[PDB]
C-alpha cells in the first residue's frame, strides 16, 4: 500500500482519437451524463436592439441527458514474487530490494491499467465514429445503446450500386466518391485514414497513385503525431489536397488479438470535430471524502487484511465519451 | 622489477 | 458583477492579419470612420524655395469618409451552475468555491468573447483582402458595402484563358503567372499563402517541387509567427525567392463549421501592407462617463435585477478594419 | 589478473538490431528460456461487472518454453609481449610500463570480446528476422532449431511469378509489391532497409528514383542512429512515406570476410517490433557466488598456475535473442 501521489507516468499516447477529436472532457460530481447540463454549442447569433437588452441565455437544454458512463474499475496484484521487466543493466541490486521491485511493479501494473482503459476507450471511439451507436454493455449489466444520432447519409455504403472492386483498376478515380461522401459531412474532410485493405483497394486505382503526393509537404502537426505514435497510425502521404493515413491498431482480447478496425470502413470528417469525454461518479470512499468524485482517473495501492490478506493496485474511472456532431462524419463500408 | 609498481611523472596528488 | 480590471488575458493570437497587415488602429470618439480625418499617407514630396516657406499641409481630405463600424456587443452568462474546464488537478476545492468558479468562468466567457470578435474580424479581413468589398450587414441593419477600391487587375482570374489544372503537371512552371500577377500589385510579394487545395495544384507542377526549398533558411519573423500560431498557418517552406505558406483556418458557424478560405484563391502582396483598424463609438454609459468611447474593446460583469434577475458578462467593440491600398494585393481565383 | 570493475567501455554500437528491435532483455537465474515465464504480451482486454471482480490473471502460459541459450564464453591472452595500439603520441613511456600496457591491452582484448559476441548476436538477429529460424549449433553440441514461427506469407518470394529484374526498368513501380508484402505484416512498415544490390535493382526503376526524396526531412532518431553508426547502415533517404536504408555490414570469419546479408533479401516490418533478449545461466563460480547468474555479460582477468602458467581475460554470456512476433516481418528474397 503506497500513497496516491505514486501515480506518475507522463505517458499519454492515445491513438489520435481521445487527444485530437475528443479533447472535450467533462468529469462530473454526478452519476450519469446530462447533455442538457453540458453547454455544448451555445445559442450563438441573436443580438438586442440599441435601446435595452434581452432575456437570459442558458445552456440550451439538450433533449437527451441520461446515459450510463462506463464505470471501469479493474485491479491487479503487485506481489513481490516475480522477476520484473529489467531495463538493461540499471543495477539489479535495487530489483533485489522488495521496495524498488514493489514500486516499479506498481508502476508497471498501473500503466497496464490506464492503457487498458485507453484501449477500451478507443474501441468505444471506433464504435462511436463508425456507426454513431455505442454499446454500454457488460455481464451483470443491462446493455444501453448510447446514440449520438448518426444519420443515414452518414451510413451510406460503397458496395451499394457500383463497388470500387467492381471498377476499372486503372482509369476509375474514387475522388468523385470522395467528394460525394464528403459533401454530406457538415464540414470539410482533411484526413482519409483507412483500414489497411481499404487503403489497398483505394490505391489500387492508378489515378490515386499518380494523384497522391508521397512527399512530406508538412501540412500540420499530424506528422508530429505520427512520429510520436509510430506504432499503428501510418502517414501514407499527401493525396494532394487531403492527407492519407492508415490505422492498423489492434486490441489483444481475452484469448486472441484482432484489429480495432473492421474489414473495409471509412469516416469522412474534420480533424477538429467536437468530442465529449463526460465522466461519471467515482465510487471510492477515498475519492468522495477527498473530492475526486469529479475527475478523470483514480489509482490506489492498498492492503487487504483477512481472507485475501494481500496487497493490490486498483484503478477506477467512468468514461462515456461521445461525439457532439454524429453528422460530422460519414461512415462508409467499402468494396 | 619496476613493472609491478609504476610511478607517473606529475604532481603528487594527481600521481596518487 | 466583478470590476472592469478583471479583464486580463495576455492572449493575442490573431492569425497574422490584424497583427501583421492591419496594425494601424484608429479608435474614435465618433461613430463612423472618417477617412478624411485619418492622415493615412501624407502628401510627402514638395519642398519650398530657399527664401521663405510655403502653405500649411493638412490631412489630405479623403474622398469617402463615411462607413458604419461593426458595433458588436455580445454577452453571455457565467451562472455558477456548471462544472468548468478543470485544468489537470489544480485543487478542485477552489472550483467548489463559487468565487473561484465565477471568476475563472468569467475568464473563460470573456476569452470566448474576444476570440469570437477576432474570428468575425478575420472573416472581415479575408473578405477585405480577397475582393476589396466588405459586407457591413446583419439582420435589423442595412447592408452597407464598404469598398477599399480593389481594381480589376487585382481581380484577374487564373481560370481565364489557360488553367493550371489544364496544363502540364510536369513541365509547366506557374512562376511565370506568379510574376504576371505580382507585377500589377503596387509592390513586391513575399508570401504566397494558399488555401490547401490551391497549394495542392500549385505544387502538382514538378518545376514547383524542385524549385522550392524545404529548408528553414530563416528569412524573417514569419517562422516565429508560425511557431506561435501552429494551428492553421503552415509554413510550407521556401520557393527560393518567396515564402510559401498555407492557411487552413476554419470558422465554426451557428450549426456547422467551414474554412475561412474559399476553394482556390490567392492574394499577392507585401507583408507590410497598410491596414486600418478604425473603431467607432462604444455605446455604453460606463464607457462614455469614464472615457472609453475611443478604445478597442470593453468588458463588464453586471447583475440584472428584476425579470431577468441574473448576472452577465458583456463585451462591446466597433471595428471597421480595412486596407489602405486595395491595389496592394492581386486577388486571383485559381484553376 | 585485474579486478571485475576494470570493465569500462561506454561503447554500445550494435547495428540497430539489438538496440532498436530487440531491447527486451531477460537474463535469468535458470539455464533455458521459458517463454511461459516471460509475460510477453499480456491478456489485455476483459473487464468485470460493476458488482465484484473476477479471477486472477497470470503470465499466459507460452506454449513452447524450452530452448538452449548460446552460452558463449571465449577468452584471450593479454601477455605483455606485444607492442600495442599506440594512439598518436600519448606518452609511450606508459606503454613501456607493464602496468599500463597490461591494463589497456585487457581493455583492447575485452572490447574485441564483446564486439565478437555482438557480431555473432547480429548473425543470430539476421537469421531470426530473415527466416524465423535460428540455428543454435556448434561442434560438440546438438543443433537446436529455435523457431519463432515465421509464417508462409512472411516468406513469400519476389522471384515467384514476375521478377523485378524481369520487369520494365523505367515504367514499372515496385510500390505495388511494397504494399503487397506490407499488408500481411501485422503492422505498418517504416524502414525498407535493403542489402546493396537489392536496393540497386529496387532503384533501377525510374518511378522509384523520382518517387524518392533525397532530402533529410528528418523523420525520427534514425538519422541520429545513422550518424552514430556511419559504418554499415546507410540512410539513402526518403521514398516519400517510408524511409530507405541499406545495410552492408560484414562479418570477418575464420579465414575470410563476407557480408551479413544474403544476396537479395528484405524484411518488411515496424521499427518498434518486440525483440526478446532472454539470457541463460552464467557458468562461472564467481558469477554464482556473487549473484551474476542472471545478467548480460561477465568479464574476468585471471592467472593460471601450473602447466599453462599464464594470465587471461575471459568473457562469458548466454544470449538467446528472438522476436516476439515472427509474423511482424515479411521476409522476401528479391529478383
Provide structural commentary:
The PDB classes it as viral protein. This is part of a larger assembly, with 3 copies of chain A (335 residues) and 1 copy of chain B (16 residues). By secondary structure, chain A is an alpha+beta fold. Chain A has a domain of 131 residues: capsid protein of prophage domain (capsid protein of prophage fold, 2-Layer Sandwich), CATH 3.30.1930.10. Chain A is 22% helix and 20% strand. In chain A, β7 and β8 form a beta hairpin. The longest helix of chain A is centred in the middle third of the chain and has 34 residues. Chain B is mostly helical and 16 residues long. Chain B is 25% helix and 0% strand. The longest helix of chain B is centred in the C-terminal third of the chain and has 4 residues. Chain B is elongated. The N and C termini of chain B lie far apart (20 Å). Classes of the chains: A alpha+beta (335), B mainly alpha (16).
Amino acid at each position: 500500500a503506497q500513497l496516491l501521489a505514486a501515480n506518475e507516468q507522463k505517458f499519454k499516447f492515445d491513438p489520435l482519437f481521445l487527444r485530437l477529436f475528443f479533447r472535450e472532457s467533462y468529469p462530473f460530481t454526478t452519476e450519469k451524463v446530462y447533455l442538457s447540463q453540458i453547454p455544448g454549442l451555445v445559442n450563438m447569433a441573436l443580438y438586442v436592439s440599441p435601446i435595452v437588452s434581452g432575456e437570459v441565455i442558458r445552456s440550451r437544454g439538450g433533449s437527451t441527458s441520461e446515459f450510463t458512463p462506463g464505470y471501469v474499475k479493474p485491479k491487479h496484484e503487485v506481489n513481490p514474487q516475480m522477476t520484473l521487466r529489467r531495463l538493461p543493466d540499471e543495477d539489479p541490486q535495487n530489483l533485489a530490494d522488495p521496495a524498488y521491485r514493489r514500486r516499479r511493479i506498481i508502476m508497471q501494473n498501473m500503466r497496464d491499467e490506464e492503457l487498458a482503459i485507453a484501449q477500451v476507450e478507443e474501441m468505444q471511439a471506433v464504435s462511436a465514429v463508425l456507426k454513431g451507436k455505442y454499446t454500454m454493455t457488460g455481464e451483470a449489466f443491462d446493455p444501453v445503446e448510447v446514440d449520438m444520432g448518426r444519420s443515414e447519409e452518414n451510413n451510406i455504403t460503397q458496395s451499394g450500386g457500383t463497388e470500387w472492386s467492381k471498377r476499372d483498376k486503372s482509369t476509375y478515380d474514387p475522388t468523385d466518391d470522395i467528394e460525394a461522401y464528403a459533401l454530406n459531412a457538415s464540414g470539410v474532410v482533411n484526413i482519409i485514414v483507412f483500414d489497411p485493405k481499404g487503403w489497398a483497394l483505394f490505391r489500387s486505382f492508378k489515378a490515386v497513385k499518380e494523384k497522391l503526393d508521397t512527399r512530406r509537404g508538412s501540412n500540420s502537426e499530424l506528422e508530429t503525431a505520427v512520429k510520436d505514435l509510430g506504432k499503428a497510425v501510418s502517414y501514407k502521404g499527401m493525396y494532394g489536397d487531403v492527407a492519407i493515413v492508415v490505422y492498423s491498431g489492434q486490441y489483444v482480447e481475452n484469448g486472441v488479438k484482432k484489429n480495432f478496425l473492421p474489414d473495409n470502413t471509412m469516416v469522412l470528417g474534420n480533424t477538429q470535430a467536437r468530442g465529449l469525454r463526460t465522466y461519471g461518479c467515482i465510487q471510492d470512499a477515498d475519492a468522495q471524502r477527498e473530492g475526486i468524485n469529479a475527475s478523470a482517473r483514480y489509482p490506489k495501492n492498498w492492503v487487504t487484511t483477512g481472507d485475501p490478506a494481500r496487497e493490490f493496485t486498483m484503478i477506477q474511472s467512468a468514461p462515456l465519451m461521445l461525439l457532439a456532431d454524429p453528422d460530422e462524419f460519414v461512415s462508409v463500408q467499402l468494396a | 622489477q619496476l613493472r609491478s609498481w609504476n610511478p607517473p611523472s606529475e604532481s603528487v596528488d594527481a600521481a596518487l
